């Protein structure tokens, strides 16, 4: 889901943005 | 008590008509319209007229207001009846722009029936309303929305102001910075020690802005009786928690207060105390209308004053006073052929920043996939002769403003020097070796000359002589050795020892009196008196008494 | 770290250091 | 004209550089890119040693974001000629964000953006960045969407010089140092070689020219086909973005969104990306099968256009969920069109909604689509208008979708005049007459802005030069209206109606534009309201430029107030300010200089300068004492209108100098003046005098001139001259020695004393001198002289008021 909606509305955390980081 | 009529106020003069009502009554309620248009003086002229009033008979109601911050003026209110507006509301706010306080803290009143109504009121504090709580009578646990307008009231003027630590490091004659110690979380703080202030994102804190002035008692309040206001000079905004300020009057009492600066949407803020400081005492002004007058050839009369501002503490008074070099003849011109008299001379807008915000928010979600001697220092300097100084020097207590000066060349032009100085500071003296100075102020320079002398220096060893007693007769004397100023001439004058002639005169430069010291005549047959008199630079001098011969 | 509710920039570095590299591409 | 395209096309779909620099090998050989492209996270560009020409257009939009170790983004794209425009992401074409390395562009080759607009922003080390004109390349419709900031350029770049290049709005048009911007003619709009040398309009971009003359269009205006441009495309071939494509290839075609691949629609002679209202794509996916349509969606909150792109096509929607439309943007960008797309598709919705701190919607207009609410909670609440500072109306007069339950929440909508909200009272199932007092801010909704009221005019009557009075022109219905239409100010309640007010203020350019609202910084002056529609003003500044209007302060709440414009008039010349610093000095015993300034308002055309000089008696001798004790060596010194200059009795002199003078003159000279009297001076501007006075006030009032003040002047000592004469000495046969002559005729002042000196011609002998205050010197016919036996030389001279005079020669006389 897009980080806008997933962070800075409602919490998050690291291990939840590390969804992102796959080359 | 008068029990004045209630109902409505449309404008100021109406609270004037009822000045000194101590009861308000007329089951109409009390209305406030006042729609000034912000011109000062409007809390001013409710509490000359309303003032007076401590109980009200009927409700009261305010709307449509213009420039009105609060209803502090009702400073003898103490309790509303409330006779009806309706039995619904004993008080009634709707609409009121710019108003954001309600009575005294410390004061607090009585409602006796009904409800109240409060919406619409954008600059006044949602948690200001819940004072009014235990104030009614029926004291309900809260006022519901149906009373209270919450999200229509306070969206721009909340005020969650968490006190914020504000102290100097230091301060200069000139200027000062500032360095807020309380810490602040721009970001989300994830709970860290502390961090009692937050903001839930950096883009939306504009930064600290900081307010500062000029006030000698240190009482400036932070708001003013008048809406616009201008005592606060305010400056840029600025994120790093530091200032520093520049161009500041030496040793003057100062006020400050800093605030933050965040987006409007946003609503938290925070707030600091009302501080001041002073400025170091730094250069001192020079000495006003110094003027002096001499008292006789060996003594001056010198006067002064200290009107200007001190910017500190005068620690003494320091004069100096030269002879300077002495008035020279003018061989310009001849004298003799022509004598002389001995005469003399002498509100933010955020657009921009959410118009950053939202696209910076649309695309990360769319990428992401997933000439002095300033030594100033008492001395004198005595003449070889030792008969006066040709320089003084003093230090005087900064609590009186004249002195006299004596033992003085007794003829010539004087400069003198009167300056004051302030202390070496604590804050200045850990290096006030490497210059640094500027302890004692400039000054101005006065110029006069001492009074002649007793007499110019009659000339003396007077005596006539003839060689080969035919030939002319002769006079000689010695030179005067102190004359006021440079010796011009001299006059030898003579008379015939007979009723009715005259006392002849002459005058002659300095010439022959190397090669014989004295003067020569081939005056005729007969007895006569002989007497002379010379003039300096400082034009006549007088005659010497009498010696006589006869002549053939 | 914990829990967190980054926002601004903030998010930005945030994802920056959680990863020195690799991101799937839009397409 | 049917003609050549320059170069070969070969399109390629919407790539991505991300992470590495090895991704540019992915954008090889292509002359044009379908869709949208960008480059983001490369930190260390530095490998970028390739560059690529080839590439002309890009169609939809670019962003360029944190980037580090690229310098200028002409680096990488040396030919981009045009953005097409097609979909614009943010309503933006060009995006260049948190780029460190960035300081230029250098992109001097590209020409049209078709449409949405640039941003640059928080690039710090970009510099020549205001010396761009952005407003000549996009499109001359309204397209302001020029945003840059954040660069520190007012210290870090100072480095604008450019060369010399064109210079227009007061700076050079560059891109740096070396490439400058270059307009074509009026005539192109960018379709040129160079600043003059055009192709045909059909070529987008430019051109190239072959050597033979045949001119090459680097894009089509409309459309391209086989390395041709056209106006329109071949039958059976569908036009996708830039180019004529078959069906099938159409259908191989894909356009991209945020997350959605959708292949493209060969419909209706277009590659059309999804179907239109009415329409729906086939379980084939191959075409759009008409339906009908409706479509559902789920509701939520629409931060940014980009969200609102997800919308598109939904005819309902559904979800308690309040929507709530809060977007903004920095001006009135394309936000009205782009959410016409995104939502002209709803007419329904299950849930109210909700908009608050918005910026830049001039109005809801774009809904024209809904029909009903439906409400749900934003508890019982219908509506919600809360913060937003640009939003004024909503609607379409026809178009009022109905509201069921709950009600209205307005507030803080400076521009949005109450009138419009009175309309909306039949679409609520209440039918009330009126809101309850907490729905709808009574002035914190429109009072900021004008956005309504009704028309008036005003116009002045009567003009002095201290004073002033005006008269409304338009009617006043007060009550029933007595005579329809022609402008009303109708009133329904004479009781509502109080008075027009009329505001005033001094302004030179009468461009003060109204009253404001915020406490102080006002300048006008208001005026008590009054009823019979005329009012007078006074004490005003004569011949000074005035601006006024004028409003009706009868709120009475009620809404259907008026107000007039801002309006301008000069008052009457008035009378002249006194001449500054007049100053007079004297040249000698006959002349003076004097010279003048009028640094004050001249108060009226000023016209001449009236200098007046008048004789004055000399300063006479004073019986106070008697001058021979010491003596007073030295001078000491400090209406109608009319020409005539006038001379002595005895033509010695000018006894007056009243002269006329223009106000060309600042200083004057003057001569044939007597020694040692003084002269009174004036110098006073005049102004002409008004059409109505030369008919009016020709008897009296006059007030042409300023006021007249004195200034005193000497002419200094008299020259040497005419001190004594005729000097001799004679002797009465013991026998007393006398002496005579004649007195000056013209002395400086009256003689005070003669001075009378002797020296024997004995070597080394001074002289003796003697006073006589003319005694009866006459009478006697010459002085009377007693001296010692010898021969003696004399001289004498004059004592007058102005102190010593010289010595006259000299002559000897023996006594025995
Ligand atoms: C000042 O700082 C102290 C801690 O050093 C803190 O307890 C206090 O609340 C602060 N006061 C203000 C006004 O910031
Ligand atoms: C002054 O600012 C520095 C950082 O610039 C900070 O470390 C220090 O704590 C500040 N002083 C106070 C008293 O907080
Ligand atoms: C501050 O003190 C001065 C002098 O006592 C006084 O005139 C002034 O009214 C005071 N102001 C406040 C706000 O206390
Ligand atoms: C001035 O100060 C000195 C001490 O420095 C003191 O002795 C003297 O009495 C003072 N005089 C006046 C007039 O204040
Ligand atoms: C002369 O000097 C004395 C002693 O300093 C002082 O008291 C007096 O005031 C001076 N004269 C004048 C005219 O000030
Ligand atoms: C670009 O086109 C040329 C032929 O003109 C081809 O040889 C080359 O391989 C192409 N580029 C890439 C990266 O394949
Ligand atoms: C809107 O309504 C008016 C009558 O109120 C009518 O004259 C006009 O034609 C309508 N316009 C449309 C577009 O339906
Ligand atoms: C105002 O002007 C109108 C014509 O425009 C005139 O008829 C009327 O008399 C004027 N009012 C006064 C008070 O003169
Ligand atoms: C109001 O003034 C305008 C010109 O400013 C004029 O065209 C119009 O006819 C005037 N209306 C009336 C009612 O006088
Ligand atoms: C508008 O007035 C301002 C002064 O208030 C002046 O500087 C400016 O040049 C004026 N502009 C026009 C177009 O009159
Ligand atoms: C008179 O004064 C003016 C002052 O500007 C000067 O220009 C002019 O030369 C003077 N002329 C004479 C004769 O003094
Ligand atoms: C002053 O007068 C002279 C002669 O009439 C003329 O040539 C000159 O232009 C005038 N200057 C001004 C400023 O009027």
């Known amino acids: 889901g ?22 | 008590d008068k029990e004045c009529s209630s109902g ?43 003032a007076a009033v401590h109980k009200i008979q009927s409700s009261l109601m305010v709307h449509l207001t213009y420039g009105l911050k609060s209803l502090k003026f009702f400073q ?27 009575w005294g803290p410390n004061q607090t009143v009585f409602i006796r029936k009904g409800g109240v109504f409060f919406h619409f009121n954008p ?10 709580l235990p104030m009614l009578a029926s004291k309900p646990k809260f006022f519901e929305k149906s009373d209270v307008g919450a999200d229509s009231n306070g969206n721009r003027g909340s005020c969650g102001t968490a006190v914020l630590n504000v102290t100097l490091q230091s301060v200069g004659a000139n200027s000062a910075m500032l360095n807020v110690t309380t810490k602040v979380e721009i970001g989300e703080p994830q709970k860290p020690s502390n961090a009692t202030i937050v903001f839930k994102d950096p883009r939306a804190f504009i930064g600290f802005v900081f307010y500062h002035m000029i006030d000698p008692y240190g009482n400036s309040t932070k708001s003013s009786d008048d809406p616009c206001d201008d005592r606060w000079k305010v400056s840029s905004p600025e994120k790093s928690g530091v200032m520093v300020l520049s161009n500041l009057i030496p040793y003057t009492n100062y006020s400050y207060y800093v605030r ?29 209308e110094v003027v002096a007058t001499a008292i006789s050839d060996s003594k001056i009369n010198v006067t002064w004053s200290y009107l200007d501002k001190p910017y500190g503490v005068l620690t003494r008074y320091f004069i100096k006073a030269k002879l300077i070099n002495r008035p020279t003849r003018n061989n310009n011109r001849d004298y003799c052929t022509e004598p002389l ?15 950053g915000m939202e696209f910076e928010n649309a695309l990360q979600n769319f990428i992401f996939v997933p000439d002095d001697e300033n030594t100033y220092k008492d001395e004198e300097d ?91 007769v002769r006079v000689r004397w010695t030179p005067p050795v102190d004359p006021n100023g440079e010796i011009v001439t001299y006059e030898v004058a003579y008379k015939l020892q007979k009723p009715d002639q005259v006392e002849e005169k002459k005058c002659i430069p300095a010439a022959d009196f190397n090669q014989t010291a004295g003067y020569l005549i081939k005056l005729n047959e007969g007895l006569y008196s002989f007497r002379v008199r010379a003039n300096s630079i400082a034009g006549y001098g007088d005659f010497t008494e009498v010696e006589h011969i006869k002549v053939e | 770290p914990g829990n967190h509710k980054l926002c601004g920039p903030a998010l930005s570095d945030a994802m920056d250091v959680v990863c020195p590299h690799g991101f799937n591409t839009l397409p």
Request: proline share 4%; charged share 30%.
């Open chain 1, 2 to 23: 897009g980080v806008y909606d997933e962070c800075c509305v409602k919490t998050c955390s690291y291990l939840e943005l590390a969804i992102y980081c796959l080359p």
């Open chain 2, 8 to 50: 409505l106020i449309d404008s100021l003069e109406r609270a004037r008509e009822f000045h000194g009502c101590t009861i308000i009554t007329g089951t109409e309620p009390l209305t406030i319209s006042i729609k000034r248009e912000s011109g000062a003086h409007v809390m001013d002229e409710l509490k000359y007229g309303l």
């Open chain 2, 76 to 102: 003898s209110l103490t309790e509303i009846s409330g006779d009806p507006d309706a039995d619904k509301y004993a008080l009634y706010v709707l609409d009121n722009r710019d108003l954001d306080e309600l």
């Open chain 2, 123 to 132: 600059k006044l504090c949602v948690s200001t309303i819940n004072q009014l």
């Open chain 2, 260 to 288: 933050t600066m965040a987006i409007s949407s946003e609503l938290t803020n925070a707030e600091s105390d009302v501080k001041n400081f002073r400025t170091n005492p730094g250069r001192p002004s020079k000495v006003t």
């Open chain 2, 341 to 355: 008299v001995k005469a003399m001379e002498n509100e933010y807008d955020d657009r921009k920043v959410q118009a």
């Open chain 2, 382 to 472: 005595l003449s070889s002769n030792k008969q006066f100084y040709e320089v003084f020097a003093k230090e005087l207590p900064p609590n009186q403003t004249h002195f006299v000066f004596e033992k003085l060349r007794h003829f010539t032009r004087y400069a003198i020097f009167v300056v004051a100085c302030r202390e070496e500071i604590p804050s200045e003296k850990l290096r006030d070796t490497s210059f640094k100075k500027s302890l004692c102020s400039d000054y101005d320079t006065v110029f006069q000359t001492t009074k002649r002398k007793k007499f110019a220096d009659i000339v003396m060893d007077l005596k006539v002589d003839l060689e080969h007693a035919e030939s002319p």
